[PDB]
């Protein structure tokens, strides 16, 4: 509450993670000298966190190493930078919000193929520019013209170390089409994926949805190969070859159903289209956004017409950006790509945000010196432009990522623009720091926006500022100190004149189009915006508090591995046995693992193995490698046709305990649990949660004042809670089969009735069956019975027996019947003679016979009020015939339908036979013991269908939360539809969520040489 | 609820540019040939491919396909003069980029809007195109290409070129999304429109098919072409399409600024959406559901209610299983819920045009654009009947295979566009109709002015004046502004050129480009303006052309002079016959009437007011507050056009007006300080009288000349220096006969002023002491234009400087000489060779030229604004006429105001014929 008081909690707490004098810590010294570690601070982050309500981020906590700045930070927060004086005001006009960069992909020269590559390249200083490889530009070598004339020109530059390589397989393409397909669209295709695994979203969630792709190109290289002989062309080249394709194809394997544009700006190209991915976001139109450039150097034609030119090309190759000795610039090929969203989607979404889009601006040159002449007043028009857009003002800009083209002519045009926008007004001592990354990478054509976005994205996420490189001196002709602009030559951290790293990248083509792009690091900010009954629950927390502390329980981690194909999933799972067994997979949580693998793309092949530690996981791993079956291994080779149907089972399903260890470690659980409870209390004036948390009721009659009502509500409140549960992780019924008791909550999850009106209905239900059996006792009563009768052969024995009735067909071969005692024995002691499986119920209940008559003006009187609605899911009505009802038709629980339910018969084994004609193979039972998985099983397999999907939710002497993960498992397997990331929740969003995933290995792609044999 | 959920303004279409097969270079010769249903599909001509019709197995193999399309008639002519590129780098353009110069151009002047007035501004361009033709032809033989087709065969210098030539600052970006890139362009440029960030949109796409490989292609893919080439949309012998070339642009304003600037728009788009495909059954199959959600986008955006279209512009591809797919969709979307007897009506362009990939939505947006403009429906060709798999009655639609009503089910017309790549992107614009709601949101004095009213209204009964119409020719070569001189009098001549008034002409002159040579012909009826035209073709010389070959380095100076300017009736004809003269008049009046306590307007509306002793009350007061009036009222009347001076220098009464005019001081300021030195020489003069009164003449002594003559006069002082030869002296009438008797004796020049006025000299010290009384309490402001300070000897004062027009500098002004030709020499020291003088009379045009002359400017421009004996309304537009030939700023649009919106504005502008181009062939050579 007060800084003295947080400084003493915060040497209390690092006193206790490290067992110190605990009063003489409290020194000047970092806590990284005090013993403790980055693994620590993430734990410290939360606990500070869940404590004052403030969220620290990495940077913030970093900057204030010591004790005394932390806790003058936690209180007062960051402080206030200095005001100043300005005669503009620079605050948006509009109302839009800022964009979040959530993921980042690389192709650049250097190998550089994942950002963590091009971060340590950038820090290092690393040259990428090298010398034309021996196998490159092999089709126009064998002529003597040709050749001599490339041996005259420069041909230095980034190049790519394996561009005919392409997995085809992966991406679905014959050989055929995959030769003709130019390299810029595998460059797209590749990116969107890698940029997609980035941002930890999965590819398969985006299916269907508004997602903007935006590539920018500027050249049709590949072209000019596939019409070296205009007979021997195949017309695959038409759509391998152009350039709508390049964003079309990413657009169609992804099914994208966003705007699919590529632009072509020459050297803005990347930055048109982020500029143009961004008003999309910002005026709907769009959920994510795609955006980059790609550029291949195929043919030597636009080199040698470059040099050709004269003056353009530089001698050695080196990029020095405003360097006292820049004599031109390098072509170079890659590609790269961002992962775009609205801030508020980023925030609810959970995703990390890498950098925040506060605005852009494009614009032209107009009549300068010549068309290829830069203009510096359509350039500081546009920079102007694009800090009014991002409502920042420019004096306050730390870095600037400029075009840096290293030309003796272009770069004092920049500098004279920057200092006359950028730098007007700054004092001498605060600068805006200079770069580029063309110095590192060279002149990416059509892709410039996009490395020099990721650079700035990677320095803004790692608060370090790389390096530029091959700068021996100012330049002569640029005035540094008068335009308050320096050169980052060496590796530097953030000025942060305005207390926030903002940064701006700029690009301009040869034709005359200008962009620039506004950057900043994403700020704290971004990420915020029953009496009886409780005393038993407050002793069974207690009591499971207890038993926790004398043994502490293993949670059970799903690990989900999928691919497109079964042998894909295996190297897969055998790549990431090999990394958990590694010390780096050792020294992470499984859940974080977990959690990692459930936002990866889930494939037509799906496994999961289900483990507690890590050596189980291992083993499962191992055992899913190969065909080896393995009890902790779910697997699939692929998706069943139809959806799932749920059984809503429960007769004879009670136990001593059911569902009270879940109540107590779910929430969900719990709420669905206190809303029915609360209904029945609302209806029937008691609470079942007493009855449930109480451990020494048997839901007998030795335990239970009306043991007839109390079982069937508990269970019915069971069955929805187990439902509503499943709904929340995005599992939902394509079909619903109900039974005797369970009609209510079928009626609910089919949507003809609302929970209160199924409560209503099986409180009314139990209650008048409850109250009918106490005055019918003696020799009025009605035993129930179990024989092997089928539905037809029943009929010739019922001839001996006229006041037998059938109850419900469970099974083909089997049926379940009511009637006298005397007379129902004796068809039993009939069924023995030819050794048949005969029991007698110890249940009085008697439903579905003559004892229920006189209950039926009792129940419609009760019943006269609900309101039936049109199903929305499919309906297998077991009251009238098993007869599948489509989603959509007329309400049909009406009273009638009830009273028709409570006094005839239940034909539950015709409506499983329909379902299984319909074509269902999975089958979902939710109730607390599976009982009526064994009469499914059994009319499935007499129906021609020996593998069926029989899934069981809770179940006797089982961990009720582990049954239910294996529940959802077995869905997901299958292909059903189940969102995996609900099973790994974020309890956190600054640096308490450093640790929440893991650095599990990529997915990998089996790349073929695919090219055009073309001679000259 | 269809209604828009974002606040977003419409877009107005105002310029329409066409290059279609079939001729079709004009939006009236395309809306001829969709009347008539006219097909432009043709058979390869001979001409084309040739480049590739020498090698057997290629030859060969171009016989085996269809290549029956729609071509263009001149694909290789190009004019390089008029876009100023040298021959070796006309011959590496892509046609794309010429026909896109084109197209801009001819859009420009479709929209009436001149493009020099654009040049500078925010003006976006989207331009769609597919494929780089060209460029195979350049890297035939890699060595012999040239660097050149570096930026000749570039994708982005399509728009980058539009931009760079014609000095657009907006965005500029060439999308490709292959058979929806026109469509996309458009809805780019719309989203930028409404996104600010651009006043003028340029959108658009082009096509060129230049060599056979795409063709031969689609040939060998098989089932795609035609086998006759023909388009049947929506036909039940849909069998393909085949492709065509050409181009098409829009230019696109915010319906608020459109109906702020007076422009005539055409039609108007409410809305429009973009999406793709997705994982459709192959990459090249389109999707249903994609185009059914496009639809319902784009009339969300819109928001319109689909059932209300009357007319949907579609895809149109003709073939047998995209068509079905279409109009699926449509019925989904657009005819779901319509009666039986309100179908949507269907038609395609393609079956007139073909397809044109890249150039379809450039098409079709301008035959809906003409549709709407022209309030009809043209007819669909290749139509034999109702396809099989089409149920059109189920899906509410209906193909119009003839001309046809707008049905306006919703009362307005409304239309859609569609466009579908075949890569599975997919666009939708919604458009509608002009409507009405578019185009809306001092008693002595007074009967002075109504007799003059009266009076005047009885003159013109009796003879009505003839008006005086400038007209504006102009090119960027004087041989061209010429030619189309003459061809503009030859049109003139012609029975249409008689039946058009000569105020329309000159308004569809005005809003042309006025390019770097100009040249005005000043007429009252066709004969005249016929004749001047004549003599313009010619280097002739005409006293009713005014003519120059390019403009000026510097600006204008404005001369405020005035001394002796004076007569009956000035500014009397002008006030009645100008509203801002007249307004700035009663301003001025006003302030003098809070200042002096009587009313300027009477003297000027009285007729027989001399201006002199026997007429007024107070002679020397009334005339300078009356010539300071005018002044006032003449400059801001220039300034109303479009006119402002690049320096002022002033003189010894027109020094208030020169502060007013370079920002020194207010225009209350300036009326106080000429009020109260008026007033004040006006009652000083009264008690001087008798001997102890000063006259001033003029003599032929220059500035140290007449030191040695001063030696025998020591009471004589300098006035003002007019010329370099011509001095202006005031003293003793005694002392001012003598050396005027002196000066005579070598046959000088020497004449007496007849005012007693007598300033700048001793006779004005008692009145300091009063001047600096009144006129403490003025705000001196620091210098918006150059001004040359006669006070400070003439010295040239940059603007933005410190004020300067303080108390002492008015004193100073008053009491000591002034320097009028030292500031003229310094002037035209400074580059300045226009001079334009604001006064009732031009008196001071002759010491300016005089000062000019000895300065080495022989060919000043010296223009002068009223005058004596002349009509001041034809004078001030001749005033003008000139500034606009010399390349000043000033906008000849003012001088053709519109007084109507609507229909009775549908007479404003005259079909005056069009921009001529000089085309010559420019090709690559090349062989295979
Ligand atoms: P430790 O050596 O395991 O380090 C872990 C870490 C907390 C530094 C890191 O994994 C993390 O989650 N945060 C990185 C923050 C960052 O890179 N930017 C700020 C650097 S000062």
Redesign the interface.
């Known amino acids: 509450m007060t800084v003295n008081e947080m400084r003493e909690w915060l040497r209390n707490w690092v006193a206790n993670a490290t067992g110190q004098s605990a009063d003489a810590i409290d020194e000047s010294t970092p806590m990284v000298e005090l013993g403790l570690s980055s693994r620590d601070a993430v734990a410290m982050a939360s606990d500070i966190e869940d404590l004052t309500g403030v969220t620290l981020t990495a940077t913030v906590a970093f900057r204030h190493p010591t004790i005394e700045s932390l806790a003058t930070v936690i209180i007062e927060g960051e402080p206030e930078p200095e005001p100043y004086d300005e005669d503009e005001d620079w605050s948006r006009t509009?109302d839009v919000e800022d964009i979040a960069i959530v993921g980042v992909a690389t192709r650049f020269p250097g190998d550089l193929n994942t950002p963590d590559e091009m971060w340590e390249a950038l820090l290092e200083g690393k040259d990428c520019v090298t010398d034309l490889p021996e196998d490159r530009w092999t089709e126009?070598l064998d002529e003597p013209?040709?050749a001599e004339?490339v041996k005259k020109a420069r041909t230095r530059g980034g190049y790519l170390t394996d561009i005919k390589g392409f997995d085809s397989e992966f991406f679905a393409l014959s050989k055929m089409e995959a030769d003709n397909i130019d390299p810029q669209q595998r460059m797209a295709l590749e990116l969107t994926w890698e940029a997609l695994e980035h941002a930890r979203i999965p590819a398969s969630s985006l299916?269907?949805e508004?997602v903007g792709?935006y590539i920018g190109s500027?050249?049709?290289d590949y072209?000019?190969l596939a019409?070296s002989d205009?007979?021997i062309?195949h017309?695959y080249?038409?759509?391998g070859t152009?350039?709508?394709?390049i964003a079309?194809?990413v657009?169609?394997?992804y099914?994208?159903?966003?705007?699919?544009?590529?632009?072509?700006?020459?050297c803005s190209?990347s930055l048109?289209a982020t500029h143009?991915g961004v008003?999309a976001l910002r005026?709907?139109?769009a959920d994510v956004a795609i955006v980059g450039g790609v550029n291949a150097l195929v043919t030597p034609?636009?080199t040698?017409?470059?040099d050709?030119?004269g003056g353009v090309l530089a001698p050695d190759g080196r990029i020095k950006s405003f360097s006292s000795d820049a004599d031109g610039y390098a072509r170079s090929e890659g590609g790269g790509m961002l992962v775009l969203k609205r801030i508020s989607d980023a925030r609810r979404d959970g995703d990390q945000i890498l950098a925040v889009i506060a605005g852009s601006?494009?614009?032209?040159?107009?009549?300068?010196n010549g068309?290829?002449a830069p203009n510096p007043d359509?350039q500081a028009?546009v920079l102007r432009?694009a800090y009014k857009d991002a409502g920042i003002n420019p004096r306050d800009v730390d870095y600037i990522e400029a075009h840096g083209t290293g030309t003796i002519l272009g770069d004092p045009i920049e500098a004279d623009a920057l200092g006359r926008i950028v730098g007007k007004g700054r004092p001498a001592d605060k600068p805006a720091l200079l770069g580029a990354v063309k110095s590192n990478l060279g002149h990416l054509e059509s892709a410039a926006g996009a490395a020099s976005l990721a650079k700035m994205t990677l320095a803004l996420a790692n608060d370090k500022l790389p390096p530029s490189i091959n700068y021996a001196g100012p330049n002569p002709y640029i005035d540094f100190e008068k335009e308050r602009l320096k050169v980052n030559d060496t590796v530097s951290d953030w000025p942060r004149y305005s207390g926030k790293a903002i940064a701006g990248v700029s690009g301009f083509?040869?034709?005359?189009?200008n962009a620039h792009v506004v950057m900043r690091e994403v700020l704290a900010g971004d990420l915020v915006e029953t009496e009886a009954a409780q005393r038993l629950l407050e002793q069974a927390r207690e009591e499971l508090e207890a038993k926790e502390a004398e043994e502490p329980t293993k949670q059970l981690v799903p690990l989900a591995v999928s691919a497109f194909l079964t042998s894909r999933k295996r190297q897969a799972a055998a790549e990431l046995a090999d990394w958990i067994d590694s010390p780096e997979g050792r020294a992470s949580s499984l859940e974080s693992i977990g959690r990692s693998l459930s936002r990866r793309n889930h494939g037509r092949s799906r496994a999961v193995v289900l483990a507690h530690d890590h050596d189980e996981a291992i083993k499962g791993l191992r055992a899913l490698a190969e065909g080896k079956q393995h009890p902790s291994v779910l697997s699939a080779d692929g998706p069943v046709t139809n959806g799932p149907v749920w059984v809503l089972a429960g007769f004879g399903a009670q136990h001593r305990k059911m569902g009270k260890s879940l109540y107590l470690r779910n929430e969900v659980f719990a709420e669905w649990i206190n809303k029915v409870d609360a209904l029945i209390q609302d209806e029937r004036g008691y609470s079942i949660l007493e009855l449930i948390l109480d451990d020494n009721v048997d839901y007998t009659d030795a335990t239970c004042e009306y043991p007839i009502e109390v079982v069937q509500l508990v269970i019915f409140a069971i069955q929805i809670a187990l439902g509503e549960l499943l709904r929340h992780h995005g599992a939902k019924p394509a079909a619903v089969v109900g039974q005797s008791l369970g009609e209510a909550a079928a009626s609910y999850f089919a949507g003809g009735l609302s929970l209160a009106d199924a409560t209503r209905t099986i409180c009314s239900r139990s209650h008048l069956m409850g109250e009918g059996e106490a005055m019918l006792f003696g020799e009025y009563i009605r035993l129930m019975a179990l024989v092997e009768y089928s539905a037809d052969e029943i009929k010739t024995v019922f001839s001996d027996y006229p006041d037998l009735e059938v109850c419900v067909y469970a099974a083909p071969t089997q049926t379940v019947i009511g009637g006298p005692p005397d007379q129902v024995d004796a068809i039993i002691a009939r069924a023995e003679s030819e050794g048949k499986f005969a029991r007698k119920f110890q249940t009085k209940g008697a439903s579905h016979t003559q004892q229920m008559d006189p209950l039926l003006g009792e129940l419609a009187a009760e019943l006269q009020g609900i309101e039936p609605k049109p199903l929305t899911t499919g309906y297998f009505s077991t009251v009238h015939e098993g007869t599948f009802i489509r989603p959509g038709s007329a309400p049909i629980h009406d009273v009638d339908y009830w009273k028709k339910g409570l006094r005839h018969s239940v034909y539950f084994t015709q409506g499983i036979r329909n379902a299984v004609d319909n074509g269902h193979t999975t089958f979902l039972e939710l109730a607390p013991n599976p009982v009526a998985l064994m009469q499914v099983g059994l009319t499935t397999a007499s129906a021609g269908l020996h593998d069926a999907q029989l899934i069981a939710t809770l179940a006797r002497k089982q961990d009720e939360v582990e049954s239910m993960i294996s529940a959802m498992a077995q869905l997901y397997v299958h292909g059903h539809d189940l969102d995996f990331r609900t099973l790994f929740p974020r309890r956190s969003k600054g640096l308490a969520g450093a640790l929440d995933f893991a650095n599990i290995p990529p997915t990998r792609f089996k790349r073929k040489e695919h090219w055009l044999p073309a001679h000259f």
């Open positions: 509009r126009f013209r040709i004339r299916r269907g508004s792709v500027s050249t049709n072209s000019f019409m205009p007979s062309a017309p080249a038409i759509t152009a350039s709508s394709i079309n194809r657009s169609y394997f099914d994208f159903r966003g705007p699919s544009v590529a632009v072509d700006t020459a190209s048109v143009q008003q005026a709907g139109e034609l636009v040698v017409g470059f050709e030119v601006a494009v614009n032209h040159d107009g009549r300068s068309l290829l359509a028009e432009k083509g040869f034709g005359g189009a």
